[PDB]
Every structure is written in structure tokens, then in C-alpha cells.
Amino acid sequence: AETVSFNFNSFSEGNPAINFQGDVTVLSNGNIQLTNLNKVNSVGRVLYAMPVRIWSSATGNVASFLTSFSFEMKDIKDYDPADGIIFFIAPEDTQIPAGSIGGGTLGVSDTKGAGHFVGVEFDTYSNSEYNDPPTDHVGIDVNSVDSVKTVPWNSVSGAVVKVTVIYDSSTKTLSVAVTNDNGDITTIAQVVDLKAKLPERVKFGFSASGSLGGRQIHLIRSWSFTSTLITT
Amino acid sequence: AETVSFNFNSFSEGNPAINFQGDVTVLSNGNIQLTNLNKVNSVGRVLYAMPVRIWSSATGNVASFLTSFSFEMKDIKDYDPADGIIFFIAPEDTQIPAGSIGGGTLGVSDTKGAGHFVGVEFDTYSNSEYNDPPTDHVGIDVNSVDSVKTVPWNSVSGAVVKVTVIYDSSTKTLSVAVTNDNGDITTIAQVVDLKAKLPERVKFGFSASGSLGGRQIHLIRSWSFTSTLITT
Amino acid sequence: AETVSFNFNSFSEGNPAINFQGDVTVLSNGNIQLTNLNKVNSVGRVLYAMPVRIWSSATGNVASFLTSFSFEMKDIKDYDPADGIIFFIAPEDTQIPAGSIGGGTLGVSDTKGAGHFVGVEFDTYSNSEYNDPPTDHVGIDVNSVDSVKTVPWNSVSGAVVKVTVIYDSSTKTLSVAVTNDNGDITTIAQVVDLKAKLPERVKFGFSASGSLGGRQIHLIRSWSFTSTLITT
Amino acid sequence: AETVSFNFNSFSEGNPAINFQGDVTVLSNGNIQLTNLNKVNSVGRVLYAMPVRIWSSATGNVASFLTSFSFEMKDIKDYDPADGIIFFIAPEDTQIPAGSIGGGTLGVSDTKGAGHFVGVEFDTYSNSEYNDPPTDHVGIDVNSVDSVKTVPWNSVSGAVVKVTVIYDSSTKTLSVAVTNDNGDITTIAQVVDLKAKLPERVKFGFSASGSLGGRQIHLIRSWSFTSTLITT
Ligand SMILES: [Ca+2]
Ligand SMILES: [Ca+2]
Ligand SMILES: [Ca+2]
Ligand SMILES: [Ca+2]
Ligand SMILES: [Mn+2]
Ligand SMILES: [Mn+2]
Ligand SMILES: [Mn+2]
Ligand SMILES: [Mn+2]
């Protein structure tokens, strides 16, 4: 029974358990601000420093995980509300894409919108080049910001959002429950073979980005994660 | 849309917002006790008074829901730790089956192990007449305590267990995440067509039971719920 | 060597190993409930029936001990979360203070806040008359609820708290480690000469109290203890 | 508040959350075996892969921690039961000393017995060159195996030992409670200023060593740990 679990009610630069990549910054209130408001094509990501072992090559087993987190997205004059926040899983050596153009890549992909990761995006800008739905949406991404499945959603400025994810190794199901501040939930599920799509050792985290004309405040308030791998 | 949400940090017999059936009893500490330690084949169930419309006959749309709750089970001398607690959904006219024998029926089914409901059971005794696994387990039940699927588990006496349930209407996937005391998680997901196994309006609740020799403390400590039905 | 060790997974009103003073009661779930939510200035205490021998008047040796216990304090309307729970050591002839006004006395001291006892309090009310810290806290008491030393701590309603206490005779140090719900830990330690402040034979226990407007649920869930005195 | 916490019921080679050094190895039963029974001057160390911030140069605050573990030491033919096990804290760059003779260095010091670290040693061999008590013992070490303090103890072959250490940042007290196979406890405390002896970032772990003729089985069966540093 191999398990990894942690709980951040607040963050702080200096905390060895966190990996800061790009324009990431930490506010005097413990919140993490992923993007820089004055940087074109801004990209900021935060990662759990310790690489998690999601599956065993020996046992063929795959872990299951439960994780919750809340974020916030507030607008700013006079930019467009973009681009979004994505919770992703990736190889332990994951770094912000080379020459990342930010924007609809969410900091996890290249220009064509491709990359090595599995995530749940909170897209606030419709990028047709990635086949984005017409309105804001929550999506399951598999090596591409061109979601495998999306669900109509609405990002409310200044609103605090709570999300809960559950990956069941057996059914290979990734279910997501989004709680808007109006008390309404939005759910989206999709089967994803992590052992097929990702390497044994991965890292979890968040990524947010902006463009020259589209920018907004992306904040990661709290995060709790628990994964268990049936070993021997 | 149509949303139903509520949070119970404690309970108190006096609030018409919750139905009590059978040997249920509410302790001075706010914990709901489901069975009676001094009665044979005891059965206690608790239902949220308001019936939840989990689907519409106009649109055909089904509701999604996110619900978390914490139970507790503890042994007693000299009796066997049985039979377990079950989180269930049933028609609003649901009641404890006529001439209930408690035991392995968990208070939701008849002798053959049949009933009209959908639920997540936390079974602590192996009933062979129902094809129970040899060890403690979590299972997805559909009109039968002969689980549709189960996952090995272990009930730690005196331990408070957290559980989070997500039902995604689009995939009709009910996935469960049980947070054990030692920290490890256990998951189980199964595709259940709620709109085809249940009526327009249902009641969500808990049930536990016992037998002649099998008895134990079944406690519902807290329960949060949110469901949203997309409407026209 | 002379060793004393016991363990309680649950308690039962009517058990020879424990003394019940005041409004203490045992619930069907095995929990010891110290105070009566309906009484005024309610006080309840529990003691291990067998008096433990912490030191010898022949050898001069003082014993060392390791004891852990889990408790729970939950809010009730429309009173104030008061007054607290205190793990204490005292003469074997200890009794609830004559005419105890409950409240900030925790049922171990008198109006002025003095008594014969050494203990670790988990204070949820700020009694200025006893120089209490402005927030909830944990204190080491020596014959007075006017703590020798205290540490900022937050009592979370309905949360099960785990406490570990180690008393090292050699250094006469008494250190405590309290486990909070959010997983964080709080500690406190202070040199206390049990030999000079208490009798050779003492009784270990818990006590809680409330006032007219200050009341809450005070539960002692479990408790393990092991002391060893070097003899001849 | 910055908090690191984990719980290992068993171990498995492959878990990235663990750093293995030297002759360490993981048995099929989940137990970590520290030393190699066929090597001379064998040394094996295990560490929590993640560095823990025990203090901040900014705030100047020192964290507190609570940790529990259990080990085993079974004798073997035809060698002498040595050298023991030590729980230690060291700079994150910590590795087994270059050219370790193992033996009484317990794997954390040079031939003279010095090194950069703090630990609680469970010494099973009397090393006069390090001023060891004449019998088995437990000692608090500060940059040297020439313990700052020791207390007589007995290492029972094949016996499972339970240990609990509490560190209070305020008093800078490190207290240890050892529970023997016979239910007896042993304790030892010492004020150790971790901010004065170690760097801000450290690693915790276990180390065991053997010699030419002195060898035994050193097992680490379980380990739980939690520390909190009050941040700004
Ligand atoms: Ca986009
Ligand atoms: Ca059964
Ligand atoms: Ca007070
Ligand atoms: Ca030695
Ligand atoms: Mn998208
Ligand atoms: Mn079953
Ligand atoms: Mn106080
Ligand atoms: Mn030594």
C-alpha cells in the first residue's frame, strides 16, 4: 500500500515541497498567482516537488487518487479574460514548453496545442485553432489542449471555485466535480489510461497563461491530494 | 438550472429536514446512530426529507451530484462487527422492507437481497448468500445487495472514514473515493443509469443493520450534498 | 521495574477501571461525554480507577510515561464553545472542586483558579481573570488554570484531535503534541517536578466544564497509557 | 503554516518518496533491511526523499515535529549483535561518510565519531573509543556518536520496538519514548537547538551499521511523521 498525501491551505515561496516554474508568484495571503499581469504570453506553473509514482512496471498496477483544490480568476482593465487554469499530470521532468506562446496552450503545450500530459482545463478563452467550444468550459486533456471532452462552464470573475477529482485505476475513470460560487455543480468524466499515456513517475500541478491581449489573475488558493498504489 | 445543496455538520431530531426510520437515534454529540446495539436484526435508516428530482421527463436530462460524508464503525463485546453502512438512493416512498431481517440486507433489501435502490455499500461481514467477497469491501449496488462490483476494503473499528461521491450524468458514472484512517484511499467506479433504475424523484440516505450475533456501532457523523439538473 | 499500562478504544458507563465524577456520561458509541449541555456551570471529570505510583519516597525515583488520547469538541447553538478539556494528574483523593462554578476552572480548580493538579488543558475560551491567551490554546497547568505556559491552537468543531504526551523523569520535562484536523501539529513542553508538586500516588484523568452561556460537546474518544518507575 | 507529513506502514523499492543509501534493501514483507549481512563494515541508510524546513532564516522560527517508528533487531550466527540503529536529521546533501568503517559510527560519523547531524541512537555495542555506556542504550546525539546523553536500555533479539519522538521548538526539547517488547517504556530528553546545529533544510531517516565480526538484522518496519513551521 504505497500512498502520497498532502494538504496546502496556503503556499509560500521557500517551501521545498513546491516547484515554481515561469512567471509564478506567491502573494502575502498564501495564494499562488500563476501569471504575470504585465508579461506578454505569460506562463506560470506550480508543481508538487515530490514525483508521484502512478503505476508499477512490475505489478502492472495503477494508482487511484482523490484531490481537491480551489482557485480564483479575477479580471483586469483593460485586458481580455484569458487564458485559463489547468490541473495536469506529467513526466517528472516536465518544464514549460520551449518558446511557449502562452495563450490557449495553457502552459502545457506547443503551438499546435500538443504536449505530454493529462489534465483538467478551465478554459476561459475560445481558441478555434484548438477547437475550443464557443463558451467557457471544463475539459479533459490528453497530450493536447484540443480537449478529448469538454463541458459548458462559466468562469465568474473574482469567484472562488472548488474542484474535486477522482481517478479510479480499475475503470481508468477521471471524474471531476466543479462547484461554482452560486452553489451549482458541473461535472465531467472520461476514461483515461494513465499507464498508457503517462510514465511511471509523474508530477502534479497547475498551469495558467495569458496572451498579449488576453490576461487575468489566476490564483491557486488551496490543494489537497491523496494517491494510493496497491503494491506488494 | 435546478440545484439542491445542504451541509450537515451534526444532526438533531427536531428538524423536519430529515426522516428517521427504524432504530435510528441521534446521540447528544450530533452523531446519527443507525442501529440499536440491544436489538435483534436491528435496522436504522436516515433520509434527507426533501425528495430530489434527479431527472426530468420533459428534457430527459439527468442530474449530476457531488456528495461527501463521514461515518464511523466500532466493535462491541461479544458480537461480530456487522453488517455495515450503505449510502443509498431510492423512490421517495421508500421505507425499511416489510419484515426486515436486517443482517446482510443492510436494511435496503428483502431476504433474497433484492430491493429498489441504488447505493454504495460499506459491508463489514461476508454474506455468502449474496456472493459477498471474503473480506470487508465497498460495493456499488443496484436493486440488490449482491453488488454489481466490489473493491477490497477494511473497516477499522473506532475510525472515522471520509467518503466522496461523484455521479456524472453524461457518462452515468458513479465513482467513489473512501479515505481510510491510515490515510490510504480506496476507489470504485461503475456506470449506473440512474434515470433507468430510479424514478423522477428520489431520496438519498443511509442505512445500517445487524443480526442476532452480528452487531456494531454505525455512525453518520457529517454529510454534504449538491446536485444540479440542467433545465430548460 | 514497576510498569502500568492500559488502553481504551471506547468506554462504557459501568466499567470498574474508570471513575465518573459529575455530569460525565458514556454514549452508545463508547464516547465519554464530560459535560451536560442542558446544565449550567456543568462539570464532568473522568479518572483511571487505579491510582498510579509516579514516584517513590524510598528510592526517590520518579516515573516516566507515554500516554496518547483522542478527543472531540463540537459546537452547539446557541451557546459559546466553552470551556474546554483538560488531561490532568492529581491526588488519588481528587474530587470536583467544592462549589465549582465550572467555566474557566475546567472543573479542576476553584474560583481563583487554583487547585492541586498538574495537567494539559485544551482551552477554547479566553478567561481574562486567569490571564488566558486571546485565542483558543493549549496550556500546561501546575495547580492553576492560569497556565504556566500556553501555545496558540485552534479548536475545530466536530474534529477528532489526537494528543501524545511524554513525561521524561530525568529532565522532568512534560511535552505534548496535538494533531489538528488540517494535519498540522502543535507542541508544547515545560519542566514540571511531579515529585514536588504531586503525591507518590496519583490519578490520571480528564475534566471539562461549561458556564451559563458557554457550552459545547466535550468527548474523550480513546486513551492509551504506559508508565514505568524504576524500583528495587 | 508550512506542514510536511507522511505515513509508511510498509516500504517498497521504487517509491520515489524514499532515498536509499548503501547496503539498504527492501524485503518482500515490506520491511526495510538496513544492513547487508555479508559485507564488512556494512552501512545502509534510508531518508525521506523530501527536504524538510525545520527553520527559517527570515522569521527565525523553528518547526516542531512528532514522529513514530518501529524497528527490529534479530541476531545471526556467528556474528555479534551490532552496531544498532539511529534515527537522524541531517543537511539535505547528507550521504554516508566517505570511507565509512561502519561499526560504532552508526553510518553518520567519521572514524573519530563526528559528523553533521542530530539523532537518537539505539546502540547495541559498547564502543569505548566513543565513550559508550557499558550496556545497550538509547542516546541523543549532536554531531557525534559520543552521545550527549544516554539511558540504559536492552535490545531484545527479534523483538519489535515502538518509538515516539517529540520535538518542541519553543523549549528546543527533543524527547523520546521507547516501548519495549515487554510493555515497559524508556525515555530520554535533551535540549537541542536545531537552528544552531543544522541548516534550514534537512532530511530525516534511519541508518544502521555493522563491522567485520559485529553484525545483525536491522529492520525498519513503519514510520509516520509530521512537522509544522509557523510561516509568515
Ligand atoms: Ca483556450
Ligand atoms: Ca454482507
Ligand atoms: Ca478559559
Ligand atoms: Ca557503539
Ligand atoms: Mn479547451
Ligand atoms: Mn456486499
Ligand atoms: Mn488557559
Ligand atoms: Mn552510543
UniProtKB/Swiss-Prot annotation, chains A, B, C, D:
Residues the entry annotates as binding Mn(2+): E121, D123, D132, H137
UniProt keyword Plastid present: no
Residues noted as binding Ca(2+) in the record, renumbered to the chain: D123, Y125, N127, D132
Keywords, comma-separated and alphabetical: Calcium, Lectin, Manganese, Metal-binding, Signal
Any one Gene Ontology molecular-function term assigned to this protein's record: metal ion binding
Function of the protein: D-galactose specific lectin.
Assembly: Homotetramer.
Note: Binds one manganese (or another transition metal) ion and one calcium ion. The metal ions are essential for the saccharide-binding and cell-agglutinating activities.
Family under the similarity heading: Belongs to the leguminous lectin family.
Name of this chain's protein: Galactose-binding lectin
Residues of the full protein shown: 24 to 255 of 273
